[PDB]
Structure 1
Amino acid sequence: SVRKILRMGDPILRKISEPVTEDEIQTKEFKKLIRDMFDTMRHAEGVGLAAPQIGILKQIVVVGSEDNERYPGTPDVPERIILNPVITPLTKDTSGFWEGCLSVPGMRGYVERPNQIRMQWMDEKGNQFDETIDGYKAIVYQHECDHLQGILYVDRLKDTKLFGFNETLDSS
């Protein structure tokens, strides 16, 4: 089921999320949440969604693309469940990108994030990963993980001048 997505301004989006436990990921409630998050993300044409965005302060993230219409020229992102993620930049190099966020509807802002990162995480089966990630995916993960730290992309704008409403940015 689709859950309501919280908008910037809701203090929940600025709070820190609690990590999920191995016991937790086996409960029906957890499974139902993941299902709703995917429904919610897909319906909103999102490429990622963090639990906080739907009111749950838990380190739960879902990603997944396939011809995303909100971010036109980006590569698809395979569906994954990212739990308790921890990202560490591996480079000072950045690949600027005009980010958007389901919690900041109608806008885009230019953000420069490290283009190569290390991410440690756990999936829905309790498997642990520790991989190097780059490209678009690296941007998505940093964006999603920021949500778990109560961080929104507007907090990382390179320049408030490079920020605006979609329809206007598109016409300019």
Structure 2
Amino acid sequence: MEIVEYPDPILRAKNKRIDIFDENLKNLVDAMFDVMYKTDMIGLSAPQVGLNVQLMVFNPAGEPGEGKEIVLVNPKIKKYSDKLVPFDEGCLSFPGIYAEVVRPQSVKIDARDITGERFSISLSRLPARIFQHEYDHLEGVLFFDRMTDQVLDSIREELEALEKKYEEKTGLPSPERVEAR
């Protein structure tokens, strides 16, 4: 199981809705939770482990044997709160890189569960923050897209280092460039 890193094009590719709720989905969900616990995360979207499908696994407590294991298939955020708050965000696709992002404080979410049944939930505080970040992955959106220009200045070099690393690894030109901003 492989964690994808920026600027890998998997992180910007279109993510397909899931229509069949079967054992392939069960097995992928188990593997995604296990990556999530191994990496000390509260949520994990599928493109981050290399699969372009609309799937997130989530434990608001982020601790084994605690909280709830939530699977969100084809999720939609139906409502964002008007109140916006700053927080220093990280991302598994950008190892060691953190910076301030402002997002709504709370959200309301519609999705389908592992058996295909509709449910909805509301999140606030750290869970709403992590949720929005991983949901953005599902739409091919990355956390520096949400950053102000001043915050982006502070990590531009760390990002260019990632772009040069992709070029070294593949021999292909970096598919996107932060200097375009």
Deviations 1:36-77 (A, max 9, x none): 11111111222211111111111010122029xxxxxxxx86
Q: Distance in 1 between matches of 2:40 and 2:70?
A: 16
Runs of 4+ in structure 1 over 4 Å off: 161-165
- Map 1:97-136 onto structure 2 (within 5 A): 97-136=87-126
Counterpart code for 1:101: C
Local SS of the residue matching 1:107: coil
The gaps in structure 1 that reach 5 residues or longer are 68-75, 166-172
What is the CA distance between 1:149 and its match in structure 2?
0.4
Local SS of the residue matching 1:35: helix
Q: How many residues align?
A: 152
Counterpart code for 2:84: T
Query: For the Cα contact (< 8 Å) 1:5–1:54, is it kept in 2?
Result: yes
Local SS of the residue matching 1:147: helix
Does 1:32 find its partner at 2:24? no
Local SS of the residue matching 2:21: helix
Q: Distance in 1 between matches of 2:88 and 2:154?
A: 9
2:140 to 129, 145, 150: 150
Q: Percent identity?
A: 33
Query: Whose helix fraction is larger, Structure 1's or Structure 2's?
Result: 2
In the other structure, the counterpart of 1:14 is 12
The gaps in structure 2 that reach 5 residues or longer are 159-181
Does 1:160 find its partner at 2:157? no
TM-score normalised over the length of structure 2 = 0.76
In the other structure, the counterpart of 1:66 is 63
Local SS of the residue matching 1:15: coil
Deviations 1:68-125 (A, max 9, x none): xxxxxxxx86321111110134322112111111111111111111112221111112
In the other structure, the counterpart of 1:169 is none
Query: For the Cα contact (< 8 Å) 2:42–2:127, is it kept in 1?
Result: no
Q: Distance in 2 between matches of 1:85 and 1:109?
A: 26
What is the CA distance between 1:132 and its match in structure 2?
3.0
Query: For the Cα contact (< 8 Å) 1:91–1:117, is it kept in 2?
Result: yes
Q: Distance in 2 between matches of 1:94 and 1:78?
A: 26
Counterpart code for 1:43: K
Deviations 1:119-148 (A, max 9, x none): 111111222123332222111111111011
Local SS of the residue matching 2:47: helix
Does 1:55 find its partner at 2:34? no
Give the structure with higher Rg (CA). 2
